[PDB]
Amino acid sequence: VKPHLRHYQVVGRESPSEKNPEPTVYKFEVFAPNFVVAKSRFWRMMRVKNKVKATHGDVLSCKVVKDAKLVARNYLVDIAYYSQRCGYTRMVKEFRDVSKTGAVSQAYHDLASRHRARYHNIEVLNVKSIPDHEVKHLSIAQYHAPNLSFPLLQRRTKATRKDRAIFVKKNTKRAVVA
Amino acid sequence: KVSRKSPEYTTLRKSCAPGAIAIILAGRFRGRRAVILKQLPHNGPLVVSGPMKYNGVPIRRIDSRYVIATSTTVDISSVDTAPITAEVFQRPKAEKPTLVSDARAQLQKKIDAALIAAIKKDAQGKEKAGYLRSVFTVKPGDAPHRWNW
Amino acid sequence: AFPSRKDAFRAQRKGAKKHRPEIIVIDLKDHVLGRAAAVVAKQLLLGKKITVVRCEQLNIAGTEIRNKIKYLQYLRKRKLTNPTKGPFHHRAPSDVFVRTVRSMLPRYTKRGMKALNSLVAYEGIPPNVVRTGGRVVIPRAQRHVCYRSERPYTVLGNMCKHVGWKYSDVVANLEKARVEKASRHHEKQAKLRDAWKSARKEALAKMPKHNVEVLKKFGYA
Amino acid sequence: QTKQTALVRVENVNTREDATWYVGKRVCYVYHGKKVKRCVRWSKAPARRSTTRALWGRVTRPHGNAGMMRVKFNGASVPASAIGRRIRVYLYPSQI
Amino acid sequence: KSHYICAGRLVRILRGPRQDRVGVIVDIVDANRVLVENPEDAKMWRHVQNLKNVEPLKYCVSVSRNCSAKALKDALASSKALEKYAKTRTAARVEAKKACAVSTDFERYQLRVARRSRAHWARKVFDEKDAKTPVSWHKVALKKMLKKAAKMDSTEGAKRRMQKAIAAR
RNA sequence: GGCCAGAACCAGCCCUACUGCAUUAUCCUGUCGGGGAUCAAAAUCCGGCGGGCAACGAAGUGCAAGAAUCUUGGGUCUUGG
RNA sequence: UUAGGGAUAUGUGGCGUCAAAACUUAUGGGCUCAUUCUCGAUACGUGAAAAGGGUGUUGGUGGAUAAAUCCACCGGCCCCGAAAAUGGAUGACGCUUAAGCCCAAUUAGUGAUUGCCCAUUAUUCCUUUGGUAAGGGCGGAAACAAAUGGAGAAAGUGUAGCCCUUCCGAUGUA
RNA sequence: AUCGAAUCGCCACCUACAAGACUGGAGCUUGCUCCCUCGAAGGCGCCAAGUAUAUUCAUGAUCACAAGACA
Ligand SMILES: [K+]
Ligand SMILES: [K+]
Ligand SMILES: [K+]
Ligand SMILES: [K+]
Ligand SMILES: [K+]
Ligand SMILES: [Mg+2]
Ligand SMILES: [Mg+2]
Ligand SMILES: [Mg+2]
Ligand SMILES: [Mg+2]
Ligand SMILES: [Mg+2]
């Protein structure tokens, strides 16, 4: 399945005024389901970092960043999440994926599964494609083997939806109720 | 272009063309295979006569909604089909109350003779002759919605 | 059950031959109890007549001791004022399956009671069921596709034999005899099956070549 | 429940795309009464006279993703005694 | 049997819009996903496939991980894996399934005629063989009954009883 | 016939098909240098430098207004003829 | 949020059976095994639980040492803490390649942006009723026996409402 | 014997059995190669008992429970 998060580059600034005739222009990296959430995250970051509110600023661009050609790569994702008891916890993880958006979506799913963290309590600090020899975790390093192979065992193979049946003869493919 | 009041007006689908072999879905000869000859004027019913020698279907009129027009066709241009008019199937009204008229038997005999010859002349004529003798039935496990006709 | 003399005389008078309704026989060996029960309950509500055999080989997830303790907790429930007319705790695997299916049905309506009465359950495959026709399975409810193989499971017959089921050995002996008889008959008739296979092979050399061409086009030759 | 619309499950129709093929087809519930009453061709075809009766309807739309169809019967609802019973889905009005 | 998921392994797509199509594994992303490409198929460009949607085949061409399209084409052509696969019975079954799916009413009638003719000639061959060496129920029963019938019909009372009640027919 | 049923056509609705415009570059190539891993490689990776449309069944990104008339879609026992 | 009926959409809530809907969806990702109040699964509703612990498993963070180790420290789910009186309640069954939990889809790296099911809600159609209702017509238009197109037409609060067209509202204790 | 019914696949090739971390068979290299019957069909049935040279079908008049049902 394609990733549920998209790579957005949000470029914006504060609205020029008499105190600030030439405001600084900020570029922002976000992974969001849509550009509305992308702009919301951009303005949250501008408010909590540069003391600029969305009501006193404007957005020069909210474009998407196209993914590179699909290649099996190792992606280092530096990410952070908030919990009430633990405060802010920052971690760095390695993922095997074909795209930056895919790796970041995998990271979001992993954080939700293992730490019960939702999208709005997670800040992605960085995502980058690292070489094979810089991978630290063995769970990711095990896919660097030049001759890597394995059989598919314990596979629940379902029939095509048009050919699925309720009652099938015991040792034949004949369907009794379908 | 053709005026709705004119007898030459049809909205019949493309599949129910003259010469097409059609499965009869309802009526006495259900499941049989017939040959579509013409459509009666004023957007009337189709006229099918799968040669009565083959399947027993006489020259009959059938609604196009009770027939599956297949992609298999037979060249009808050699068959007259002109004597089959709407007045052939009209009957006198009874007053305060198998046998076939000689005109209807003659029309069937002449049409079927030219219809059988058109099948023989056609390539795969012996296969299509036996195709019309076959009977269509819905079997256990059949999925006509997935089929191509 | 046993036919009335009126029914027998009426059948003779009408002269109709023997009749058997459309009954689906399900080999319940290595099937998940709840999933098979849900599928069978829906099919029974959809007007099907269903016989289920080998109910002693149904599977439940978890340890046999855990499921035994679950059944003992079930057995703990009884009407204190009058245990007779309280819950009735059946120990046979077919009775367990029938209770499970009944709990998936509206058992307090006439429609639900007809659906429940449309079901027949057995231990093993009885003689009146052996030769009726090919048994069927429920792919949605088979253990080898429903259970992680590393997890333990229990067999319904083994679980039931330790809560008060007396006929485990009887069913085992009858099933052993049935399999021996069926294996003997299958060792026989092998000549007939091979003769039919050879006849099908030899027909290809005597039927018309264009018919063989159609058979090869559609994958039957 | 709303008895004006009925749910019909046809054999080998297990997808919504399959159930869309039958939209508009005629539907029949065949049963019998206790006495022989009037029928079509009561005089033309006396062989048709029987305790056999039929209620007709049409397929209106599919129901769900699993090939069910909604059916509306002519003028009146189908009896609740027909639930779990056989229904005939005819191949007409043909569109092919 | 079970063929390993390796770089170069030929797979068939189980379900989806690419079903019944044959591709070659060119890279392994993780435990769940692989990269599949087939230069000889129009719709089989380099794409990501979940490992639940592939069926490993017995053929495995010699390529490296993340191989180029030209290298994949050369390896496929040299190994002749597609030509070898086309000769199997499951590939022919897939093609026959497609033909049956696209078949018309006339084609269905033709197939029915072919199957009926094969059944008729199988019946004739079986009857010929069974007349010589009995395998059917009726022929085995006749073989069993023949000796007893010959013994019990050779008696004079039997013979006279036959003659007398045959002369009346 | 003021009954029952089926097909035709009208009008109005209600569903579906059929898609163009703008974007892309953290991208696409080639080639050098590194770096990597191998039996040797290749690749993942990082720099230069030269190109450039990953290209319309490219992209799951913005917005789409495409007369179901051409080109007899479907439905209306959900309307009236 | 409520005139009385249809169609089509939704909302909250759902799609293993009961029970409509994934005939147990995906060609999505992880986590979890729980032996007698029997793991868990509905907010509100501690409408059941802590302090404290676990060499259960799987994730982080900072050290250390060198074939990879081991040291403290934080999550996640599970377990221990955790005892009441009729037999009993995730809702019943059951579920554990979940039918549990966290996240994410909508037919799945194929080619875009509405899976499906349920309201006295929305949109629309028909009818009623009542308006702080809005308009038209109302000087018989000419003609026109039967045997063999027709009727009616009231200057009007309220009627079988003078007729026609239009719009909007309609639940309710005292 | 009322009684008219609803129901619309036959089999004497399915109607034995087991397994999915497998269940065509080898090899050793243990995930590849090789061989095979090539690992994705229970058999029939569907209108000439069989694939051709046939042959009766109407007026049951265009839908109606198939107006019939020992396959
Ligand atoms: K007791
Ligand atoms: K109609
Ligand atoms: K899952
Ligand atoms: K009014
Ligand atoms: K008045
Ligand atoms: Mg609705
Ligand atoms: Mg349901
Ligand atoms: Mg008035
Ligand atoms: Mg009031
Ligand atoms: Mg009848």
mmCIF file of C-alpha atoms in Angstrom, chain D residues 9-82:
data_model
loop_
_atom_site.group_PDB
_atom_site.id
_atom_site.type_symbol
_atom_site.label_atom_id
_atom_site.label_comp_id
_atom_site.label_asym_id
_atom_site.label_seq_id
_atom_site.Cartn_x
_atom_site.Cartn_y
_atom_site.Cartn_z
ATOM 1 C CA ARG D 9 -29.098 -13.810 -1.827
ATOM 2 C CA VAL D 10 -28.542 -15.454 -5.219
ATOM 3 C CA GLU D 11 -26.215 -18.412 -5.706
ATOM 4 C CA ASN D 12 -22.798 -17.592 -7.217
ATOM 5 C CA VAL D 13 -23.515 -13.857 -6.825
ATOM 6 C CA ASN D 14 -20.930 -12.864 -4.209
ATOM 7 C CA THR D 15 -19.846 -9.356 -5.263
ATOM 8 C CA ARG D 16 -21.545 -5.981 -5.600
ATOM 9 C CA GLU D 17 -20.413 -5.879 -9.233
ATOM 10 C CA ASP D 18 -22.186 -9.225 -9.653
ATOM 11 C CA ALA D 19 -25.361 -7.961 -7.964
ATOM 12 C CA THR D 20 -25.385 -4.883 -10.211
ATOM 13 C CA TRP D 21 -25.914 -7.210 -13.189
ATOM 14 C CA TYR D 22 -29.274 -8.351 -11.798
ATOM 15 C CA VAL D 23 -30.683 -4.864 -11.152
ATOM 16 C CA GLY D 24 -34.065 -4.669 -12.860
ATOM 17 C CA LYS D 25 -34.468 -8.429 -13.256
ATOM 18 C CA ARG D 26 -37.790 -10.017 -12.368
ATOM 19 C CA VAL D 27 -38.081 -11.988 -9.134
ATOM 20 C CA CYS D 28 -40.606 -14.638 -8.131
ATOM 21 C CA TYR D 29 -41.597 -16.340 -4.882
ATOM 22 C CA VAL D 30 -43.447 -19.592 -5.605
ATOM 23 C CA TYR D 31 -45.567 -21.176 -2.871
ATOM 24 C CA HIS D 32 -48.892 -22.978 -2.589
ATOM 25 C CA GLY D 33 -52.166 -22.283 -0.815
ATOM 26 C CA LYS D 34 -54.802 -24.783 0.363
ATOM 27 C CA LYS D 35 -57.447 -24.314 -2.387
ATOM 28 C CA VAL D 36 -57.143 -23.965 -6.216
ATOM 29 C CA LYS D 37 -57.913 -20.274 -6.953
ATOM 30 C CA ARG D 38 -57.706 -18.290 -10.212
ATOM 31 C CA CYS D 39 -54.478 -17.833 -12.164
ATOM 32 C CA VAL D 40 -53.178 -16.598 -15.502
ATOM 33 C CA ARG D 41 -54.758 -18.553 -18.370
ATOM 34 C CA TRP D 42 -57.350 -20.136 -16.098
ATOM 35 C CA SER D 43 -59.493 -20.717 -19.206
ATOM 36 C CA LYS D 44 -56.864 -20.741 -21.963
ATOM 37 C CA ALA D 45 -54.723 -23.332 -20.137
ATOM 38 C CA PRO D 46 -56.778 -25.419 -17.687
ATOM 39 C CA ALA D 47 -53.655 -27.522 -17.069
ATOM 40 C CA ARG D 48 -52.212 -24.519 -15.209
ATOM 41 C CA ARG D 49 -54.923 -24.607 -12.491
ATOM 42 C CA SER D 50 -53.216 -25.574 -9.174
ATOM 43 C CA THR D 51 -52.813 -24.604 -5.490
ATOM 44 C CA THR D 52 -49.499 -23.124 -6.736
ATOM 45 C CA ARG D 53 -49.193 -19.345 -6.440
ATOM 46 C CA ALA D 54 -46.446 -16.854 -7.219
ATOM 47 C CA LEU D 55 -45.643 -13.340 -6.017
ATOM 48 C CA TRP D 56 -43.641 -11.188 -8.418
ATOM 49 C CA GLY D 57 -41.181 -8.361 -7.869
ATOM 50 C CA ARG D 58 -38.044 -6.719 -9.236
ATOM 51 C CA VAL D 59 -34.433 -6.201 -8.209
ATOM 52 C CA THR D 60 -33.852 -2.546 -7.304
ATOM 53 C CA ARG D 61 -30.249 -2.262 -6.064
ATOM 54 C CA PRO D 62 -27.441 -4.318 -4.516
ATOM 55 C CA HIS D 63 -27.031 -4.560 -0.746
ATOM 56 C CA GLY D 64 -23.519 -4.519 0.687
ATOM 57 C CA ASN D 65 -20.328 -5.716 -0.971
ATOM 58 C CA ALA D 66 -21.189 -9.441 -0.885
ATOM 59 C CA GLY D 67 -23.696 -9.801 -3.718
ATOM 60 C CA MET D 68 -26.997 -9.377 -1.903
ATOM 61 C CA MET D 69 -29.786 -7.566 -3.708
ATOM 62 C CA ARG D 70 -32.750 -5.478 -2.631
ATOM 63 C CA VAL D 71 -36.073 -6.575 -4.103
ATOM 64 C CA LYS D 72 -39.427 -4.789 -4.242
ATOM 65 C CA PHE D 73 -42.504 -6.954 -4.743
ATOM 66 C CA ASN D 74 -45.506 -5.804 -6.744
ATOM 67 C CA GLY D 75 -47.813 -3.655 -4.636
ATOM 68 C CA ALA D 76 -47.455 -5.667 -1.437
ATOM 69 C CA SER D 77 -44.631 -6.931 0.736
ATOM 70 C CA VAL D 78 -43.435 -10.533 0.628
ATOM 71 C CA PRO D 79 -44.742 -12.676 3.524
ATOM 72 C CA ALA D 80 -42.456 -13.330 6.468
ATOM 73 C CA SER D 81 -43.148 -17.039 5.951
ATOM 74 C CA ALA D 82 -40.988 -16.760 2.809
#
